[PDB]
């Protein structure tokens, strides 16, 4: 079993690139980050900033999570991100994703000590 | 009781303005659209495009909804939107919102005949 923090890193962190490299970025990443194993995870966002910058969001703008929880934080700045979403031709175990690059604020839920991201809520 | 389509329009459509007009936009809109009545709705997005343009998204890019449903659609173009999110000083019945303006693709779930938006899933 993964810690909540490590699962966030696996699902959402890609500091190795400044932005999605091709239209196939999501197909490759959803697979290598183990998000197509038991099923096709329908929607998932990768952040192309350092881990330190993403962790720093937990000390930024406190905002409500979509579900009403009070431990969500919005980044003061925009960040390079990629939205991966299953498309019509996607059928487990043959998972297919649309790659959409963008620059926006991210909203994450934070927990623990050290207080670090444990869920990606949204981007704005 | 509202139809699903009318509830979408009430919660998410603002074609009267090209973008949020002030930092108080969300406080005003969340109230007048009746989203602070029984509780503070934690998160809500308004779209500043014509209703025809938003309805047209149901014939655009078919993508998975965050919950796995297959009836979600992503707009081919970006749209002017405003993200409203409760902030720390928010306590029902005194609801307080942060206003964040942006330009991005919207993702909506569509249902019915006419096939129209019934849920705002996300923006990218």
Swiss-Prot record, chains A, B:
Impact when changing residue 119 to A: Loss of activity
Tissue localization of expression: Pancreas.
Main subcellular location of this protein, as a coarse class: secreted
Binding residue positions for substrate: 7, 10, 41-45, 66, 85
Domain of life from the UniProt record: Eukaryota
GO cellular component: extracellular region
Entry EC number(s): 4.6.1.18
Catalytic activity of the protein: an [RNA] containing cytidine + H2O = an [RNA]-3'-cytidine-3'-phosphate + a 5'-hydroxy-ribonucleotide-3'-[RNA]; an [RNA] containing uridine + H2O = an [RNA]-3'-uridine-3'-phosphate + a 5'-hydroxy-ribonucleotide-3'-[RNA]
UniProt-listed GO biological process terms: defense response to Gram-positive bacterium
Disulfide-bonded cysteines: 26-84, 40-95, 58-110, 65-72
Effect in UniProt of substituting residue 12 to A: Loss of activity
Record keywords: Disulfide bond, Endonuclease, Glycation, Glycoprotein, Hydrolase, Lyase, Nuclease, Secreted, Signal
Keyword Nuclease recorded: yes
Localization: Secreted
Family, similarity comment: Belongs to the pancreatic ribonuclease family.
Function: Endonuclease that catalyzes the cleavage of RNA on the 3' side of pyrimidine nucleotides. Acts on single-stranded and double-stranded RNA.
Name this polypeptide is given: Ribonuclease pancreatic
Boundaries of the shown chain within the full protein: 27 to 150 of 150
């Amino acid at each position: 079993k993964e810690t909540a923090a490590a699962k966030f890193e696996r699902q959402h962190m890609d500091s190795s690139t400044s932005a999605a490299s091709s239209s196939n970025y999501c197909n490759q990443m959803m697979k290598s980050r183990n998000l197509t194993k038991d099923r096709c995870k329908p929607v998932n966002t990768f952040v192309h900033e350092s881990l330190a910058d993403v962790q720093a969001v937990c000390s930024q703008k406190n905002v409500a999570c979509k579900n009403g929880q009070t431990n969500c934080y919005q980044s003061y700045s925009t960040m390079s991100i990629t939205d991966c979403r299953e498309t019509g031709s996607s059928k487990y175990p043959n998972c297919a994703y649309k790659t959409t690059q963008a620059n926006k604020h991210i909203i994450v839920a934070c927990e623990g000590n050290p207080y670090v991201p444990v869920h990606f809520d949204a981007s704005v």
